[PDB]
C-alpha cells in the first residue's frame, strides 16, 4: 500500500531532476532492506525527452535517458515522425537516416519505480495467544519511505 506519491520536480543548472517521495506500508512478516527496489507495472508516468540527431546517433542509435515503455508523441522540425521511420530496440532509438541533421522530440510513458530510502517503522510486534496452543510472535507491517528512481534508471525485471 502506497501513499503521498509526490513527483518532486527540481530545476537545476545541470538540468531537471525528480526527487519525489512516497510512503509505503508492507505486507506482514517481511524484512525490507535498504535500497530494495519496487516497480508498479500497472502505473505509467509521463516524461519528455529531446535529442539532437547526428551521424553517430544514426549509426549507433540514441540511448534513451528513460526506460521507455511506449511513445505517445514524436516529432521533428519537418513534422510528425511516422512509425515506419523509427524503431526502439533495447532502449535504443533508431531513426531513418533521413533525419541525419534534425532534432527529435518525444513524449513517453514509463513504469513507476521506487527505491527504499529509509524505513520509518522497521519493527512492529504482537504476541498472539488467542486460539493458539502457545504464544506466537508476529511481525506487523513496516512503514517504508520510498524515493523515485530518476538518477540511475534500470530496466524492468522482465
Amino acid at each position: 500500500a502506497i501513499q503521498s506519491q509526490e513527483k518532486g520536480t527540481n530545476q537545476l543548472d545541470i538540468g531537471i531532476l525528480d526527487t519525489g517521495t512516497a510512503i509505503g506500508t508492507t505486507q506482514l512478516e517481511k524484512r525490507i532492506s535498504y535500497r530494495d527496489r519496487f516497480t508498479v507495472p500497472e502505473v505509467l508516468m509521463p516524461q519528455q525527452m529531446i535529442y539532437f540527431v547526428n551521424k553517430d546517433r544514426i549509426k549507433k542509435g540514441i540511448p534513451l535517458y528513460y526506460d521507455v515503455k511506449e511513445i505517445t508523441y514524436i516529432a521533428t522540425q519537418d513534422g510528425t515522425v511516422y512509425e515506419e521511420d523509427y524503431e526502439i530496440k533495447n532502449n535504443r532509438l533508431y531513426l531513418n537516416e533521413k533525419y541525419e541533421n534534425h532534432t527529435v522530440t518525444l513524449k513517453i510513458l514509463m513504469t513507476l519505480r521506487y527505491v527504499v530510502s529509509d524505513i520509518l517503522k522497521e519493527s512492529r510486534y504482537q504476541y498472539t495467544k488467542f486460539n493458539q496452543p502457545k504464544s506466537k510472535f508476529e511481525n506487523l507491517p513496516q512503514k517504508l519511505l520510498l524515493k523515485r528512481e530518476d538518477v540511475i534508471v534500470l530496466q524492468d525485471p522482465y
Partner: protein
C-alpha cells in the same frame, strides 16, 4: 449437527482443541429425552410390560 453449523467450529480459545464428539452424543441423547417428553410418545424401540 455440524452440518447445521456449516462454516463454524467450536474451539477452546486457550488451546485450539475442538470440542469432543462425546459431548455431542450426550446432548443428542438428552435432546431425544426432551422430545419424548414434549410429546407423549416413545421414540426409540423398547419392550414395555404393563
Amino acid at each position: 449437527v455440524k452440518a447445521y453449523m456449516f462454516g463454524i467450529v467450536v474451539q477452546n480459545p486457550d488451546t485450539g482443541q475442538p470440542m469432543g464428539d462425546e459431548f455431542y452424543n450426550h446432548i443428542l441423547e438428552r435432546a431425544v429425552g426432551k422430545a419424548e417428553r414434549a410429546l407423549d410418545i416413545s421414540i426409540l424401540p423398547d419392550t414395555q410390560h404393563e
